[PDB]
Design an enzyme around this catalytic site. Structure first.
Site, PDB file in Angstrom:
ATOM      1  N   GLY A  66       3.655   3.473  65.737  1.00  0.00           N
ATOM      2  CA  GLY A  66       4.791   4.357  65.910  1.00  0.00           C
ATOM      3  C   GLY A  66       4.454   5.525  66.802  1.00  0.00           C
TER       4      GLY A  66
ATOM      5  CD  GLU B 249       8.994  16.885  64.618  1.00  0.00           C
ATOM      6  OE1 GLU B 249       8.482  17.913  65.128  1.00  0.00           O
ATOM      7  OE2 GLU B 249       9.181  16.760  63.381  1.00  0.00           O
ATOM      8  CG  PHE B 250       4.787  16.936  64.533  1.00  0.00           C
ATOM      9  CD1 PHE B 250       4.867  18.233  65.032  1.00  0.00           C
ATOM     10  CD2 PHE B 250       5.426  16.650  63.330  1.00  0.00           C
ATOM     11  CE1 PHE B 250       5.553  19.227  64.340  1.00  0.00           C
ATOM     12  CE2 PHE B 250       6.121  17.641  62.634  1.00  0.00           C
ATOM     13  CZ  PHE B 250       6.183  18.931  63.143  1.00  0.00           C
ATOM     14  N   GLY B 251       3.668  13.303  67.236  1.00  0.00           N
ATOM     15  CA  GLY B 251       2.765  12.515  68.040  1.00  0.00           C
ATOM     16  C   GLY B 251       2.780  11.073  67.609  1.00  0.00           C
ATOM     17  CD  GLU B 252       1.234   8.804  70.796  1.00  0.00           C
ATOM     18  OE1 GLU B 252       0.093   9.242  71.078  1.00  0.00           O
ATOM     19  OE2 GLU B 252       2.273   9.150  71.412  1.00  0.00           O
ATOM     20  CB  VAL B 253       1.934   6.885  63.148  1.00  0.00           C
ATOM     21  CG1 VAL B 253       1.345   6.303  61.886  1.00  0.00           C
ATOM     22  CG2 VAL B 253       2.702   8.159  62.848  1.00  0.00           C
TER      23      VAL B 253
ATOM     24  CE  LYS C  51       2.411  11.648  58.549  1.00  0.00           C
ATOM     25  NZ  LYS C  51       3.510  12.674  58.570  1.00  0.00           N
TER      26      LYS C  51
ATOM     27  CG  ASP D 153      15.994  13.797  58.215  1.00  0.00           C
ATOM     28  OD1 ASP D 153      17.148  13.325  58.408  1.00  0.00           O
ATOM     29  OD2 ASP D 153      15.104  13.744  59.101  1.00  0.00           O
TER      30      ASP D 153
ATOM     31  NE  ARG E 252      16.822   8.954  60.529  1.00  0.00           N
ATOM     32  CZ  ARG E 252      18.070   9.155  60.108  1.00  0.00           C
ATOM     33  NH1 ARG E 252      18.857   8.117  59.826  1.00  0.00           N
ATOM     34  NH2 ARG E 252      18.530  10.390  59.954  1.00  0.00           N
ATOM     35  CG  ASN E 253      13.500   9.996  57.476  1.00  0.00           C
ATOM     36  OD1 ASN E 253      12.752   9.883  58.443  1.00  0.00           O
ATOM     37  ND2 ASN E 253      14.695  10.572  57.561  1.00  0.00           N
TER      38      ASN E 253
ATOM     39  CG  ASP F  14      11.216  13.138  57.893  1.00  0.00           C
ATOM     40  OD1 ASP F  14      10.957  12.862  59.088  1.00  0.00           O
ATOM     41  OD2 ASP F  14      12.006  14.062  57.585  1.00  0.00           O
TER      42      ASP F  14
END
Length: 256
Positions: A16, A19-23, A41, A134, A138-139, A152
């Site tokens: 994935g 938001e902040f970066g990659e997983v 993360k 939220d 999807r979370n 999330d």
């Protein structure tokens, strides 16, 4: 916020781009302990120190939680660069994609089991005075044995009207969202309100339109969604009663 040595971590494939970066998927092997899979993360390359602080305060929040249906924080990497957050691995990914790729392949009682797990974890969060704001399919993540965990740590069609008209975010408006998740799950990942525009949803909710029962959805479960979508936020059930209602359905499967 336990400190993990980066050499105990192997980073495998990406899974994935958040938001902040990659997983990444990885392997964690601490001395004398059995190796587990983990999610790793990362912060997007070039992050600033304030972006680092924000990132590591997300982890401090997740470390307060210890519940079978909240994503477990394994540790953080802060002594070397880059910073990483290590969490438990969920083999089946997000609940929405997972249902969408397994349309019709789970029984009603297995889906109520997942809905019960989500509620239990939402109850735990409400009980410690955290509003999620939220809560959507999807979370929610799903492990190898179909246990659903909340992660999330404004999407209009998941948000309660008093959170779409007066910025009032409470556990009661999380409950509205939980109802939408219930509909998403029972429809195997259909989009709430489909192609309606954000404003059409707002106008239709205000004239007392509510989503219909998903195909083959028990009346009892659709009634519980309707209770989650009460206009007045204090007439909505609390997560305690949602867990108890679903426990009684799982036990009295005729209920369904």
């Amino acid at each position: 916020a336990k400190e993990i040595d980066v050499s105990f971590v192997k980073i495998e494939e990406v899974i994935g781009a958040g938001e902040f970066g990659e997983v990444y998927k990885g392997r964690l092997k601490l001395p004398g302990k059995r190796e587990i899979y983990v999610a790793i993360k990362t912060l997007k390359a070039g992050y600033s120190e304030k972006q680092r602080r924000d990132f590591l305060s997300e982890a401090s929040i997740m470390g307060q939680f210890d519940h079978p249906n909240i994503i477990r924080l394994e540790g953080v990497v802060t002594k070397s660069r880059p910073v990483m957050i290590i969490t438990e691995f969920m083999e089946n990914g997000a609940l929405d994609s997972f249902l969408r790729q397994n349309d019709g392949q789970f029984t009603v009682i297995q889906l109520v089991g997942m809905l019960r797990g989500i509620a239990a974890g939402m109850k735990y969060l409400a009980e410690m005075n955290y509003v999620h704001r939220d809560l959507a399919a999807r979370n929610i993540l799903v492990n190898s044995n179909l246990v659903c965990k909340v992660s999330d740590f404004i999407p209009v069609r998941w948000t309660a009207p008093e959170a779409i008209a007066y910025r009032k975010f409470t556990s009661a408006s999380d409950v509205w969202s939980y109802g939408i998740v219930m509909w998403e799950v029972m429809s195997f990942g259909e989009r709430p309100y489909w192609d309606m525009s954000n404003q059409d949803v707002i106008n239709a909710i205000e004239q007392d339109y509510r989503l219909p029962p998903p195909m083959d959805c028990p009346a009892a479960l659709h009634q519980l969604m309707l209770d989650c979508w009460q206009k007045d936020r204090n007439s909505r059930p609390r997560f305690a009663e949602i867990v108890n209602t679903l426990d009684k359905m799982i036990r009295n499967p005729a209920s369904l």
